[PDB]
A paper describes a structure:
Influenza A virus has two surface glycoprotein antigens, hemagglutinin (HA) and neuraminidase (NA). NA is a homotetrameric type II transmembrane protein with an N-terminal cytoplasmic tail, a transmembrane domain, a hypervariable stalk region, and a C-terminal head domain. The head domain, which accounts for ~80% of NA protein sequence, contains an enzymatic active site that cleaves sialic acid to facilitate virus release and prevent virion aggregation. The enzymatic active site of influenza NA is also a target of several FDA-approved antivirals.
We aimed to analyze the fitness effects of mutations in the NA of H3N2 A/Moscow/10/1999 (Mos99) using deep mutational scanning. To further examine if the active site constrained the mutational tolerance of the surrounding residues, we determined the crystal structure of Mos99 NA in complex with sialic acid at 1.6 Å resolution. Although the sialidase enzymatic activity is the major function of NA, mutational tolerance and the distance from active site only showed weak correlation (Spearman’s rank correlation = 0.18). The correlation did not improve if we only included those residues within 15 Å from the active site (Spearman’s rank correlation = 0.03). These observations substantiate the notion that optimal enzymatic activity of NA relies on the global conformational stability of the tetramer. When we projected the mutational tolerance data on the structure, two clusters of solvent-exposed residues with low mutational tolerance were identified. The second cluster was at the membrane proximal side of the NA head domain, consisting of five residues with low mutational tolerance, namely R283, R288, D304, D355, and W383. Specifically, R283, R288, D304, and D355 form a network of electrostatic interactions. Furthermore, R288 forms π-stacking interactions with R283 and W383. As a result, the low mutational tolerance of these five residues is likely due to their critical role in NA folding stability.
Residue numbers in the entry:
A (entry chain AAA), B (entry chain AAA), C (entry chain AAA), D (entry chain AAA): 82 to 469
The structure:
C-alpha cells in the first residue's frame, strides 16, 4: 500500500452516468433504517462508501420526532459500502454533527465535530484511532465540509469554518498526516464567506467549490497548495450561478472576484469543477427551494466573467421532486481521475408536514466520456405511506 | 489473479442436482425482505452470488403496491452471496431496470440500464468504478440479458436489444475490457428477434440461447466470436421447443433456421446448451403460463431439425406451482466447466390477487455426472398468509 | 493451506467447560430468527460455525405453523459463525432436510439430501461448487449424520442410511475427495441399525457413535479405515446406555456386541468417545423424553461389557428443561485434539401446545483438562411470551 | 504477526476527545437490539471492538422483563466492531455473566465466567478455541474485570475475585499464554477489597485501578509484574476519590495506604491512571448515584497523600443524566501508548419504572495531546417512548 498522489489527468467528461441510489426513505416504511442528513461518498482505492450524519435513531421510532435540528449529542457519522442503505448493522465511526472523511491510500481519516455550539471539539481519527483534536477557535459552531477531504502523498487537507453564518467568519485549512495536524493556514483571497467545501484533487494541489451563506449566490473557490500550505480563493466565473437561493437566469451574474450580492444570504452545499476554460456544475432546478437537480457545462464558465452559454444539460431530479445537498468525489481510473457527485434527497419536515421526522436518501452519478440518455431519479417515497 | 479463459471441456451431464434455494417469499411474511424480479446467479472463481432487480422497497411496506411494472427509477441491482436472501443489508450495486453481471477472473463487471423508456442509459461498472456508458441507439427500451455475461482472456461480452418487443429490433453484442467498450457488433444471422440471452463460455467463443418475443416459440441461438467480433445466429433445432407460450408437444416444431410462427408472440427468458448433437434444456411445464418447470435432454436436438426424442426428464417445479424466468450460469471445476441454472419463482399480481405486490424467490440446480432422484421445489409461500 | 490429518493425541479430559450458547428462541420473540432443528457445529482451522436445518421461515411468521415435520422442499442448511444466531442475513448453503458438513483443511464439504422420500438426491458441494450427486439406493429416506463429517489427508468420510427406521436398513460409508465420491463401502460388523452418526478423527481412522432406532438403547459404534475403506461396527460397552428411550440405570445393560433389546425402538442422536478403556458420554436425563442433559465418564465403559461405574458427572441442562439431539465435534489445539459437543434445545410442538411451531436453540461445551463447577444452561424462553 | 509488548511511552495527555457513541437505547425503540450491561472496549492492532454482557434477549421482547439481575444462564459476551450497535447479527463469543477480553498481538483471549453462584466455571478461549478452565476457589461468585485484560510478550494477565462483596475476599491474578493458565498469584499488598479492575499496560508491567466494595470510596491500585508474577497493591492517593458512593469533596480523603472508611460499602467500576506524579481519573458527578460523569487531573494526586488540587475538568455526561460503569482501554500509536475510556449509560429499572427492563448504551473518549471544548453526551432515550 502506497499513498495516493492523484497524479493522472482529469478524465474527459461528456456528462454523467447513473452510478448508485439507496432508496432509503422507501425502505424506511418497511424496515429499520437510520434517520440521516448531510450524506456524502468517498472511495478507498478499491471501492466506494456512503456516509451520512445519523440522528441517533431509526425512522419508525418515536425518537425520529423533530429531527430537523442540525446539531445534537446523538449525531454520529455512519459509514457503509456504497449502495448498502443505513440498516441497524451500520457502523457509527465517530461522534459528529459535522464531518469530512477521506482515504490517503493507506487508511481512512475522519474529521468529526461535536459538542456545544459555543465550544465544539473536532476529533481526528486515522486508521481506527484518535490521533488529534482541536477546540473551536471562534466559539461559533466549528464546522466542516460534509463531503470528502483529499490527500496527496500522505498529506490530507480539510476546510473548516468557525464564526457567523451571516457575516465575516474564520475559515482555516488544516493539513493532516496520518491523523496529526501538521499545519493550519487561514483562508486568504477574495472569497468572503466559505462553508461546506466540495474539494477534489487537481494535482499538484486541491481545488474546492464551496457555499457562501452571506452575500453570494455565486459559489466560492478555494485552492490549496499542499506543498507550501498557501491558499487562494475567489468565485466561480459562470453567470449561471450554483447556489440556492439565487436570482433567475436572466438576472443572475458573477464576475469571478466578489460575492454577487444577489439573494446571497443562506445557501446549499454544492459543487463544480473546471474542464479547461469550461465549468461543469450541478444546482437545484428551483431558484428558491431545494427542489430538482440539474447539471450542465458552461462554455468558458471557468475563465470568462459572467458567461452563461450552457450545453450538455442533464436532469438528475425533476423539478417536481425534492433535492438537498450535493458534493463531489473523485475516483482513480487506469489512466485518468474521474469526477462523480451525489445528491441528498431530503424528505419530511419542515416542508412536508405529514410526518414529524426529517431524513434523506441519496442518488449518485459519475463522469463519463461516453454517451447517455435522460431520466429522473428522485427519492420516490410516498409521504402518505410513511410512519409519522 | 489471472483472467478466466474457460479453456476446459464441458463436464459430462447426466441431469441436474439441487444447489440452492432462498425461500424469500416465505421469509418476507416475517422479516424485511426486498421486492424483486429478474434474478440470476454468477460466480467469481471462489463462490457464487445471487442477483436480482429490486423494486426500491421491501415486501411488507406500502411501497410494494403495484410492483408489477418492469421499469421505474427505483429499481437497483442487488447482489448477495448465493443463499443469502435479500435482507436490508443487501448491497445495491447500480441503478438498473435491466442488467447483466460477470467476473473476468480479476473483478466484477456490471451492465446496468436505467432512465426513460425512449432514451435510457447503460452504465458499465468494473472493479467498483464507472468506466463507460452508452445511450439508447433506437429509442425503444434499451435492455439486456437479465443473467450473467461471459469473459474470455479479459474480454467480456454482453447481448443488448433496443427496439420493438413485437417486430424487428436492433440487437448488438458489446465487447468490454476492464469496463471499457472496445467493440460493438450488430446481430447477424437467421435469428429474427433476440432478447434476454442466456450465455455461456464455449471456448474459444461464447454461445447464447435467447427469447424471441415476436414470431418464435423456438429459442434463438447467438454465437459470439471474441477474437474477431463476428456473430452468427439461428434457432435451437429441437421440435420440443423452449418458450412460453408455445403449442403442445405433438403440434410444435422447429427446423433450426427460422422462427416457427407457432404462438410466437411474447415469451419468457430461458436457456439450453449443447452436449454433442444433443441439447439439454429447461422450460415451463405449462404451454401457456409461467407454471411448473422441467428439464430434459433431446436426443439429436441440437443437430437434427425437429427432433422430439426426449430422455432424462426432471421436474424442478411441479405443474401446480408458479415459475418464471430461468437462466444459465457456468462454474469452473478442476477439469471441466459445469453448467447450472436458476428458476425465478414469481408470486403475487397479476395472477394472484390476494396481495398488491409482485415479487419472487429462487431455486438453483447444477449439472451432475452422478445420479439423482425426484422432487419439486416451488416457492412455498401461502398467499393467504402474506401482507397485502 | 494444507490438508488436516488430525495426527495429534486426544487431549486429556477431566470433563467439559461452557463454550457457546445462542439463545435463539428467546431472541425469536423480539426479532426475525429462523425456525430450525437438527443443529450442529463444525470448525475450520481458525474458527467454529453453527449449522442447522432451516424450515424455510422465521418463527414470528404464519409459515412457522406445523413445522414439526422433518422433510419439506423448503428446508435448507444454514451456516453462521458460532454464536451468531440465525438472523435474516444467514446463508443457506444448500437445499437439505438431512446434512453433514466438514472442512478438510482447504475448504468446506457439504452433504445435502433433499427431494421425495422414496427417491431423494444427495448433493456434494465442495469449495462452493457442486462436485457430485447420488440418488437413493433403497428408496426409503436416504439420510445422514446431522453433525460434522471428518477428513484425513484430503479424504472426507460420511455415514448415510437408506431404509427402514424400524428394521434392517442399508447403511453406507462414503469417501469423498474435494467433493468427488471415490469409494463407497457398506456397513459391516455387529451394529444392526445405524443412523445419525457422531464421528470424530481418531488418527489414523475415524470413529463414530450413532443411533440404533430399531432394537438398541445402547449406541452403535462404527469405525472407518480411510486408507483401505474397511468398516467395523459394534455397540458401546457401557451398561449406562446413551439412547432415549432406555430402561432405568439398574435395569439397563450392554455387552458390546449386539443391540440390547431394551426399549430399543426409536432413539435420539447422541455421542460418546473413548479415553483409554473409559468412555465419556452424554445423554438426556429422562429415560423416556428428550428432557435434561448430563455427561459423565464410565470407568472401563469402553472396554468392559456392562460397566456402570460412573464418575465426573455434569448437568448441562436440568431435568426440568427440554433437550434434543446432541453431537460431537473436534478442534485441533497446539499439541492435542479436543472433543466438544453441542445440545439441541427443542421448543414448541408437539410437546408444548401454546405455539404452533417447532424450533430449537443450542448450547455447546468443550473438553477441558482443567477444573469447573456446576450449573444448568437451558433454552430459557417462556413459552407463554412467544408468538403462536 | 508479533506479540504486543506495549514498550512505548505513555502519550502526553491534555484531556480527552470524543471517540465513539452507540445510541443503542434510542435505537432499541425502533429496531431489534440486545439488552446488555457491563460493556467495555478493547482493540486489536488495527481496530477497536465494543463488548457487553447480553441478557439473552432484545429490548422490545417479553424476555426483557426483570433484566436487572446480574447473573443468569442466558448471559453471553457480545462482540462487535466499535460503533456497530448490538443488532441481531452480533456474535455471542462465550457464555458469560462476568468477562474480560484482550488481544495479544496474534489473537483474542476471552475469560468468561458462568454457572451457579456457589460453584461457577471460568472458560479461557483463545484464537477461537477453549484452552483452559477453572472452577470457583471460594464458592462465592467467581468474577472478573468487566473490561480489557492486558498482554505483554504473549503473557496476558487478568484479575479475578471470589468471595464476599462486603468483607475479605480471595482475589487472584492469572497469567495466561495462548489461552493456557501458566501461573496464578494471590493478591498481595494493602488493598483490602478488589473487584472489577481497569488495567492498562505500563511497560514492563500492568497497572490496574479497581473497585473496593467493602470499606473504601478510594479506589485500589494493583500492580502486576508479568516477568516474576509478583503483585503489589494500595489505593489512589488523590483526596478527590473515584468511587460511588463517596463523601462530598470537602469531607472525602485518601492517604494512599488503606481504605478510607468513608461511605466505603458498595461501589461502581471505574478507572484512573498516572501521569508522572499526577493522576487522570473519571467519576460519576453524583456522590450517591450513578448519575453524571466527569474527568479531571489531580495535581500530585498519584504521589501526594490526599491531594485535592484539580485542573482540566471535563463533563462527559451532565449531572442530570444517567451513567454507570466506566473502564480504561489502551491503544498503540506510532510513538506512544494512548489511554481511552468508555462510560456505560444505564437505563430502566430499578431507577426508571416506566419500563420493566434494564439495559445500557455506551459513550467513549480517548486521550488527546491537542485541544477540545465542552459538551454532554448522555444516552438520549426518552423513557416514555420505549417499549415497556
Ligand atoms: C436523449 O438524451 C440526450 C442526452 O441527455 C438528450 O440530449 C441533450 O439534450 C439537451 C437538451 O437539448 C442538450 O443540452 C442543451 O444544450 C443547448 C445547447 O446546444 C444546442 O445549441 C448549440 C449552440 O447553437 C448547438 O451547437 C448544439 O448542437 C445544440 O443545438 C443549451 O441551449 C440548452 O440549455 C437551454 O435549454 C435548457 C432546457 O433544455 C434550459 O434549462 C437552459 O436554461 C437553456 O435555455 C441545454 O444545455 C444536451 O447538450 C444534449 N446532450 C448531448 C450529449 O447531445 C436528448 O435530447 C434526449 N432526447 C430525448 C427526446 O429525450
Ligand atoms: C427416481 O428418480 C429417477 C431420476 O430422476 C427417475 O428416473 C428418470 O425417470 C424419467 C421418467 O421415466 C426418465 O425420463 C423419461 O425418459 C423417457 C425415455 O427413456 C425410456 O425410453 C427409452 C427409449 O425406449 C429407454 O432407452 C429408456 O431406458 C427408458 O425406458 C422419455 O420417454 C420420457 O419422456 C416422456 O414422458 C415424460 C413423463 O415422464 C413426458 O413429460 C414426456 O413428454 C415424454 O412423453 C422421460 O424423458 C429419466 O430418463 C430417468 N432418469 C434416469 C437417469 O434414469 C425414476 O423414475 C424415479 N423413480 C421414482 C419412482 O420416482
Ligand atoms: C462443584 O462442581 C464440581 C464439578 O462439577 C462438583 O463435583 C463433581 O461432583 C459430582 C457429583 O458428586 C461427581 O460425580 C459423581 O462421581 C461419583 C463417584 O465419585 C465418588 O465416588 C468415588 C468412588 O468411591 C470416589 O473415588 C470419588 O472421590 C467420589 O467420592 C459418582 O458415584 C456419581 O454418580 C452417582 O450420583 C449421580 C448424582 O450425583 C447419579 O446421577 C448417578 O446415577 C450415580 O448414582 C457422580 O458421577 C464429580 O466427579 C465431581 N467432579 C469433580 C471433578 O470432582 C462439586 O460437587 C460441586 N459442588 C457443589 C456444592 O455444587
Ligand atoms: C471551553 O472548553 C474548555 C476545554 O474544556 C473549557 O476550559 C476548561 O475549563 C475548566 C473549568 O474552568 C478548567 O478546569 C478547572 O480548572 C480549575 C483550575 O484552573 C484554574 O486555576 C488554576 C490555579 O490558580 C490556574 O492556573 C488556571 O489557569 C485556572 O485559572 C479547577 O479549579 C476547576 O475545578 C473546580 O471547579 C470545577 C467546576 O469548573 C469543580 O467541579 C471542581 O470541584 C473545582 O471546584 C476545574 O478543574 C479546565 O482546566 C479548562 N481546560 C483547558 C484545557 O483550559 C472552557 O472553559 C470552555 N469555555 C466555555 C465558555 O464553555
Ligand atoms: C416532538 O418533540 C418536541 C420537541 O422536543 C416535543 O415537544 C417538547 O415537549 C416537552 C415535553 O413535554 C416540552 O417540555 C417542550 O416544551 C416541547 N417543546 C416544544 C418546542 O414544543 C414534542 O412533545 C414531541 N412529540 C410530539 C408528538 O410532538
Ligand atoms: C396502489 O398504487 C396505485 C398505482 O399508483 C395507486 O393508484 C393511483 O393513485 C393515485 C393517487 O390517488 C391516483 O392519482 C392514480 O390515478 C391511481 N392510478 C391507478 C391506476 O389507479 C393506488 O392508490 C395504490 N393504493 C392502492 C391501495 O391501490
Ligand atoms: C396450520 O397448518 C395445517 C397443516 O397444513 C393447516 O391445515 C391444513 O389446512 C388446509 C387448508 O385448509 C387443509 O386442506 C388441510 O386439510 C389441513 N390439514 C390438517 C392436518 O388439518 C392449518 O390450516 C394451518 N393453520 C392453523 C391455524 O392451524
Ligand atoms: C416479570 O418477571 C417476573 C420475575 O420472574 C415475573 O414474576 C414471577 O412470575 C412467576 C410466574 O407467575 C411467579 O411464579 C413468580 O413468583 C413471580 N416472581 C415475582 C418476584 O413476582 C412477572 O410475572 C413477569 N411479568 C411481569 C408483567 O411482571
Ligand atoms: C449546523 C451545521 O454544522 N451545519 C448546518 C449548515 C449551517 O447551518 C449553514 O452552513 C450556516 O452556517 O446548514 C444546514 O443548516 C442547512 O442549510 O441545511 C445543515 C447543516 O447541518
Ligand atoms: C422491460 C424490460 O426491460 N424487460 C421486461 C421484459 C420485456 O417486456 C420483454 O422482453 C419484451 O421486450 O419482459 C418482462 O416484461 C416479462 O415478460 O416478464 C419483464 C422484463 O422486466
Ligand atoms: C427424516 C430424517 O431425515 N430424519 C429425522 C430422524 C428420523 O425420523 C429417524 O432417525 C428415524 O429414521 O429423526 C427425527 O424424526 C427425530 O427423531 O427427531 C428428526 C430427523 O429429521
Ligand atoms: C454479579 C457480578 O458478577 N457482578 C456484579 C457486581 C457485583 O455485584 C459487585 O461488584 C459486588 O461483588 O456489581 C453489579 O451488581 C453492580 O454494582 O452494578 C453488577 C455486576 O454484574
Ligand atoms: O436563459 C434563458 C435561455 O436558456 C438558453 C437559451 O439558449 C434560451 O433559448 C433559453 O430560453
Ligand atoms: O409427446 C407425447 C409423448 O411423450 C414421449 C412419448 O415417448 C410418449 O409416450 C408420450 O405420450
Ligand atoms: O445407579 C444408582 C446409583 O448411582 C451410582 C451409585 O454409586 C449409587 O449411590 C446411586 O444410587
Ligand atoms: O472542592 C470545592 C472547590 O473546588 C475547587 C476550588 O478551587 C473551589 O473554588 C471550589 O469551590
Ligand atoms: Ca448564498
Ligand atoms: Ca416467443
Ligand atoms: Ca433406540
Ligand atoms: Ca466502595
Amino acid at each position: 500500500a502506497e499513498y495516493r498522489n492523484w497524479s493522472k489527468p482529469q478524465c474527459n467528461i461528456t456528462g454523467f452516468a447513473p452510478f448508485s441510489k439507496d432508496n432509503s426513505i422507501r425502505l424506511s416504511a418497511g424496515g429499520d433504517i437510520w434517520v440521516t442528513r448531510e450524506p456524502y461518498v468517498s472511495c478507498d482505492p478499491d471501492k466506494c462508501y456512503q456516509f451520512a450524519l445519523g440522528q441517533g435513531t431509526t425512522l419508525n421510532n418515536g425518537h425520529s420526532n423533530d429531527t430537523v435540528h442540525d446539531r445534537t449529542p446523538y449525531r454520529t457519522l455512519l459509514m457503509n459500502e456504497l449502495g448498502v442503505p443505513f440498516h441497524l448493522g451500520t457502523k457509527q465511526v465517530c461522534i459528529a454533527w459535522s464531518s469530512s472523511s477521506c482515504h490517503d491510500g493507506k487508511a481512512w481519516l475522519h474529521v468529526c465535530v461535536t459538542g456545544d455550539d459555543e465550544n465544539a471539539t473536532a476529533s481526528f481519527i486515522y486508521n481506527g484511532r484518535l490521533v488529534d483534536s482541536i477546540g473551536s477557535w471562534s466559539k461559533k459552531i466549528l464546522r466542516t465540509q460534509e463531503s470528502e477531504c483529499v490527500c496527496i502523498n500522505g498529506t490530507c487537507t480539510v476546510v473548516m469554518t468557525d464564526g457567523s453564518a451571516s457575516g465575516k467568519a474564520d475559515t482555516k485549512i488544516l493539513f493532516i498526516e496520518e491523523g496529526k495536524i501538521v499545519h493550519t493556514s487561514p483562508l486568504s483571497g477574495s472569497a468572503q464567506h466559505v462553508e461546506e467545501c466540495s474539494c477534489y484533487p487537481r494535482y499538484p494541489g486541491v481545488r474546492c467549490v464551496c457555499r457562501d451563506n452571506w452575500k453570494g449566490s455565486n459559489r466560492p473557490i478555494v485552492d490549496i497548495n499542499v506543498k507550501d500550505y498557501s491558499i487562494v480563493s475567489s468565485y466561480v466565473c459562470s453567470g449561471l450561478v450554483g447556489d440556492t437561493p439565487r436570482k433567475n437566469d436572466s438576472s443572475s451574474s458573477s464576475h469571478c472576484l466578489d460575492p454577487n450580492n444577489e439573494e446571497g444570504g443562506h445557501g446549499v452545499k454544492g459543487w463544480a469543477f473546471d474542464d479547461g476554460n469550461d465549468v461543469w456544475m450541478g444546482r437545484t432546478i428551483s431558484e428558491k427551494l431545494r427542489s430538482g437537480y440539474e447539471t450542465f457545462k458552461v462554455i468558458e464558465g471557468w475563465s470568462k466573467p459572467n458567461s452563461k452559454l450552457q450545453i450538455n444539460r442533464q436532469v438528475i431530479v425533476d423539478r417536481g421532486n425534492r433535492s438537498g445537498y450535493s458534493g463531489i468525489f473523485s475516483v482513480e481510473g487506469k489512466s485518468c481521475i474521474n469526477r462523480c457527485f451525489y445528491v441528498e434527497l431530503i424528505r419530511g419536515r419542515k416542508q412536508e408536514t405529514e410526518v414529524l421526522w426529517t431524513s434523506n436518501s441519496i442518488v449518485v452519478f459519475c463522469g463519463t466520456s461516453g454517451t447517455y440518455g435522460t431520466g429522473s431519479w428522485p427519492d420516490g417515497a410516498d409521504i402518505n405511506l410513511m410512519p409519522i
